[PDB]
Design a protein around this ligand. Sequence first.
Ligand SMILES: [Zn+2]
Lengths: 173, 208, 298, 103
Amino acid sequence: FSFKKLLDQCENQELEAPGGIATPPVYGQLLALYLLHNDMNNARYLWKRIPPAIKSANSELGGIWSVGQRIWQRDFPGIYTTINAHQWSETVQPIMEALRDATRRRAFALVSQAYTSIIADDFAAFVGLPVEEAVKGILEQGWQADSTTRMVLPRKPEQQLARLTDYVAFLEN
Amino acid sequence: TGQNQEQFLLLAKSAKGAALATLIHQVLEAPGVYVFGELLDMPNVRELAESDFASTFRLLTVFAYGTYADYLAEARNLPPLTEAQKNKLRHLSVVTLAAKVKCIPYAVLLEALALRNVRQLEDLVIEAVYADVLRGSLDQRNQRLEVDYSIGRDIQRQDLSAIARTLQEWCVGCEVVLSGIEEQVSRANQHKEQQLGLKQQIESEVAN
Amino acid sequence: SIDEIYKYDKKQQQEILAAKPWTKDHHYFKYCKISALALLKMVMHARSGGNLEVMGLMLGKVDGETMIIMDSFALPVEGTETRVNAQAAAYEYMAAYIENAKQVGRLENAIGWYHSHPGYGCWLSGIDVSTQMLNQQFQEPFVAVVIDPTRTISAGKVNLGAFRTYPKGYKPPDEGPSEYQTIPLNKIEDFGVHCKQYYALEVSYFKSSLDRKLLELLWNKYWVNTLSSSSLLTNADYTTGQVFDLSEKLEQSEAQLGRGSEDKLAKATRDSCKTTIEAIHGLMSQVIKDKLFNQINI
Amino acid sequence: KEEQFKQVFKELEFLGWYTTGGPPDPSDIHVHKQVCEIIESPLFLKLNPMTKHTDLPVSVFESVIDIINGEATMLFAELTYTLATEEAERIGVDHVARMTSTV
Ligand SMILES: [Zn+2]
């Protein structure tokens, strides 16, 4: 909602302020926001645009891209591990939690569509939460859980006249 | 109802306390009489309210406004009813459900009418269609009752405004549709003439 | 006087039939007046035939250059459009029907024949021309009426034509406005071969003073039927038939552009336009119904 | 006439009779009984071409055999009726009623 407005503002600050090269915290925000919208094509080309000087001076930026590598490889457990590794309060930390929540929603929506029956450990690793928490959540939601085999069975979930008048007005002339 | 209205109103104006109290048990246990608006608005029956026969007036209020579940909740106070009267009240409850929504699932009907198996419910809906109370069809597979037409039961003097609230909502609806056409038709001309005019300009350049 | 046309003057008809002014001019008959009853009966019969051609006889009279149709009746015949003078198979039936009609006060005699062209427009085919030429040779005065029930429904406008043939060897004048109609490819060749062997009369309609009154009073309840039309599925086979023909028309217009008539694509475009416009009008009535009866709630 | 109409309207059947005038009278009952000799329960349609009123002057009736003062007699009971939904008929009727852009 408000993250998109901050993205557009950062996209304006990307060209208005420089100077040749933009501000490092804005680069960090732009990279993490490019990860938030899953636009990996924008994130990969943003990281390669960063000069080696800011890449060496600001290691936290490399710590943001280390999440992107895992998003690019689609290794969910690695994404959840890389999110909870670095701290950059006020600037990057408040949007990294939104990335974690968005990755959780993305993974849950993927498992609910792509799987009929999935191993509980694989699903827990896909959402990031531990096995017990995940099984509790899906049983509360309405998914069919099975012990011994440790299988989870997911459940898959004028205005009109003016347009028509324009179509007839087109055909008739 | 129509004949029964005059037939019982003639007795209603010429009856007293106990005779009216038994007449209530006679009108409720009579086929075809599903509306009690004229009988409940009588001063003779108004005298029974808050008197010796208060539960009978409350029973008439349930039969004219409430449902079978409302009767079950107050069965300890209300007088006992036979199978025919219990059926009638169930028919009226289906009418209230049909007044709310067009497609009623069997589960809501079984819960609201307090029934055990499907056939009992199906036989009651049949009795409803047979007594010209409801019109519609039953769907076994999807376990749903499709209602085509349902009669009017509740009079509601205070809530009468709600009827107008929907009627006006329909009126405004018409008033939009009508204006819509008026505009669209106008646009259909507004384009045509314009195009003709434009064509007449193109055709005037052929001479040059 | 609205009802003046309903007066039957037997002696005046006999005088006209003895005079035979049509023999002095092959373009003598210019107008065709059809009663609301005959129009409704012919359209009702034409629709009842569905996608198959039906035919019947028309009862009426003549008045100057005007042919008047008062009534009509279906003929139980096979081979309309394939058999020359198919009506002949109903000769006996026609004689008895008319005899019985005279017993109840139907005084007007045979004035013509009507038949349907479901989904392929109003005109006379080779078979129709032979039939009408026979009728004009032996049953003069006679007129041929053609109705397209399918196009009537789809367009929401009556699709009817009244025609008269020219005698063998006689050439038409410069006149021939020819109001454009989409003719399907399986019929266009025959249409083109015989289109100059006949002419179209100017059609008009009439109703009585009582019909006028009754139709206003009918409207006071008939309005309900206009908001419950369901035209899109009633004659759904027409649009599909037209599209099936349109595709072959487009195949010919493609063949015209291929190597090497006068712009077939524009004709095909006007045909596809008309068909689509009719379909959208159907949807317009459906959406109007949805706006009036479904978008209300509690 | 039945032998004739059966050749072109094979799917249709005799349903009743019509006449013109005001409210039903003894003559209508006499004729209705004659029609009852042809079909079991015929309809009776009456059209008033000299109407003074604002409603469509067409009425449809069924015949009921009732007991009045010990005499079993025939009477008419009026039926409510609706108009037909044929598309081609609606267009024809509309065109007739109107008698004078695509949208
Ligand atoms: Zn033909």
